[PDB]
Amino acid sequence: LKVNREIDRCKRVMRERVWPHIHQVLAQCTVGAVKNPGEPEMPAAFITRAVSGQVIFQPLAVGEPWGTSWGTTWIRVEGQLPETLPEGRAIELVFNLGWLEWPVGGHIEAMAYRADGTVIKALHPRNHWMPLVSADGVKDRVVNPDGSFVVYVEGAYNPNVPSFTVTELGTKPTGKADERYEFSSIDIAALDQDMFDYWADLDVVTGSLENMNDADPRYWKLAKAMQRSINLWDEKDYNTLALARKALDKVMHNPANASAMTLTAMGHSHIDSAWLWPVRETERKVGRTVSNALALMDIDPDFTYVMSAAQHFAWLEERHPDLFERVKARIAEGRFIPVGGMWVESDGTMPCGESLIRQISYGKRYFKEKLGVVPNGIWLPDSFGYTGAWPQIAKRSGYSWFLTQKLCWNDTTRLPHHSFMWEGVDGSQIFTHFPPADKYDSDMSANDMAYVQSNYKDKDLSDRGILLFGYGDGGGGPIREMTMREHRFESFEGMPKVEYGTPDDFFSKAETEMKAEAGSEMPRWKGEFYFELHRKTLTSQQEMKRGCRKEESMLRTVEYLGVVASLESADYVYPTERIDRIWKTLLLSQFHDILPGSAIEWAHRVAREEYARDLKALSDIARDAIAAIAVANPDVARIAKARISQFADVDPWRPASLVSCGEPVEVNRREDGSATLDNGLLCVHVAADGTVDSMIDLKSGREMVAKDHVMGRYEILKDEPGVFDAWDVERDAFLCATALADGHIVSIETTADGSAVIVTKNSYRDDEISTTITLRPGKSQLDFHADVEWNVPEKLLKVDIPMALSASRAQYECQYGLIERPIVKNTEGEEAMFESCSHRFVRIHDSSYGIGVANGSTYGSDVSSLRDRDDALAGTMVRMSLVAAPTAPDPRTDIGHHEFDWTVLPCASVAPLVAAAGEINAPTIENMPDIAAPITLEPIEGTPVIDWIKLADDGSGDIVARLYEAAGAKAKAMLHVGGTLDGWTVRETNTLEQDESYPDEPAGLIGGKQQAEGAELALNPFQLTTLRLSRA
Amino acid sequence: LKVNREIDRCKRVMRERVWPHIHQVLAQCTVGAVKNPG
């Protein structure tokens, strides 16, 4: 059609006949540079060293790469600012350092400083210009009395790292220029605002023709004015410009339709704290983005910008002190908004409950003392699913709403609604919203308006949405082209109304109006947000998953010992600052890019050796605190190899030992190679090739292994996905798995305590798996411990546990509580859940029985039914993923020597499973005097569990316990305290240890603040309460 | 749909897992050149 061919003419007119005549080049500047391929130094220490004499600045070469990979080049620019400058026009430098266009935050960047150490503005691929004079006769401070000036530019020659492709770029500074980026004559230019407005109008108009339909007369009244204008603009006669704009004005002022939506736009750039670059680079990225944000708050007023991740604010505070005081000046104004008080945008499903609570707490604490703000909602646009315990934690932490967008990438199903009420397992509900643009980084195009209005899933009762724009995922922020195409879409009949705003006000009014409109028809979602994509993120880099749990499972012990030692010994200083530093370092390695393990080899290498260092430092605070208890109770008892595991079967926080102390375990070797372990409580029969093939529960007398199957068979899948190698698993892999039928028992023995051990070996073509199966006296559980020497890439290992019990749903655990997922997947959407998360245990049960499996560091599994060889129902298979080896961002990921531990239990109720999980995840310590816990609850009914006894953060000396219910039934208990804190009071708080109550949340205590000894507790299913004990 | 996403996997298999293993490199050759812009 004629119009579609007229759109191409208009776009080419924009690109060649209008765009170049915006920056009129006046003069070019002399340049000299100094290169450095090493690690960068602080800019302030370089400038003052670069002002006196101590740098030479050998001139650059036009047409050659100005740096090396992962290096820094400092450039001294000197211009002249000649006279006869155009009147009423702005003057600005233009830096064209060989930019590409596709990745904004990916390849090279830069930052321009003044000759005192102060930032001017950052330089990015699509935003490369620096204001000298502002079209009003006022100059920047870096201008002499004459036209002389001098600028320093720190340029980062970051390589462009492909997402999924084998490369050597994400390892270390190479010292070579792999991708060539030229220099090409930094220059000075005058800006023409009228041509720039004309280009903006053309852009707005021509982008609306691709998205309208040829049925409204506006499609034709537009395409006529677009044609009349470009037929009138002759770039060789400037006086025609004023004629061309008047033609493209009879259509720019048309009031929006009556029923059009209303969008609240705010500037937002998402910065992945570590992904495709080292963590030593994110600091500069935050600096650049923030500087860009403030240089756009003087192009126009009423422009708003949001920023999350208090850790980014801290990084900014240390590197650019001057750029911090400019932010605070905008915060008090109201145009700069910090949102979602959290340390970093953590992962949404893997961290435990205490991780999330501590993230919220540290974030709220930083946002208070520094910026003085109190956020009202959780900002989490990018995450691989959400745990389902989030609503309760958010509501009990003072929050009011919630924000997500990542759940659009699901491979099978689309969620029904965009704005809805999300109810967790407890019952508390939070208002949640997805930005209808289906992405956080928009460019404020006409395509995005058309999509937002034509995709919004609740247009019948909401007509209100949010809209984020800016260049994200690597920084950069929004560009001044986006802001000046927003004023065109303010009314613009044919498209949604758009206006600036803050998130809190949008959320308040949107929720209240949707409520008062819908009635008791408000959309609702109960449960978790299962992410139907990126299944391999549960096991991508195993040393990160093992590190997140081992460090956090022992922070519990270290913090508990600080409580016990601060009550026994009269002089013992609890090291608050070391613990705070360790906690912040931990919360930084739970970002949504490094816990899933989908970053470059460099990032994981640094994050891995941090776990080693903080693990070591933690087990010195422990032994130094235990030394204090050892002198306070000098003659009670001391045991080596103790494990303080919360919620045991008899004594909750007593430090139990490793010596089992039962009667020996009789072992009956058979002649064919098989063996028979038999303690008082189990009768295990191990076959000739590992693989326990029958397990009797001698108490009840039930087989525990599904017939014609063996427990412990190893499979190795062949996973070579289409895209996102380190991210997701094909379903095809589940078809290709091959068992390792070869194998044998290496050794059968008994030990000093009386337990029996069996040592097995297994191999697949290069690598070796040696398992140790243990049976201890007086414990109704079987323990497995495997050591892997993984060497072959592109493979995936997992073990299976065939259970002799058949049910319709499987039971996992959440951060606080439990969930169930189907076993046999019926519909198309259910088959998308073929692999799922599991914190610390999975249970398959029925009305009166059940079998459970608890793990140490795995985090991943999948369940399916089992059918006998005569085709009758046999049981259920539970497979849990151990280690995978991708190749995309990390060529040499997960090579060599992984450990794994797990255990299998017969459990009618859920209490012994929780006890076994807690007891397998606890760290070991030495020379620990065994003394009763200070806080104890006697269970009158149900199963309440005290999780995280710890000290107060106010330094006052109070105790804070975080107790919940872990069975799904109401629980009644009462508190008993030891003889070291009698006379103390107890009271109820929120998760942040503050006296704040909420009318829509039940409480634990009955009454108010009363005596601790004898206070009673009632807990409705999956409730999370926090007790605070004070001396008075 | 599942098939359209299975086409991408097959095309990438062609491009990376099948195509490079066609020309097995044995040895490289010494080279010398003379240039002429006329």
Ligand SMILES: [Zn+2]
């Ligand atoms: Zn992200």
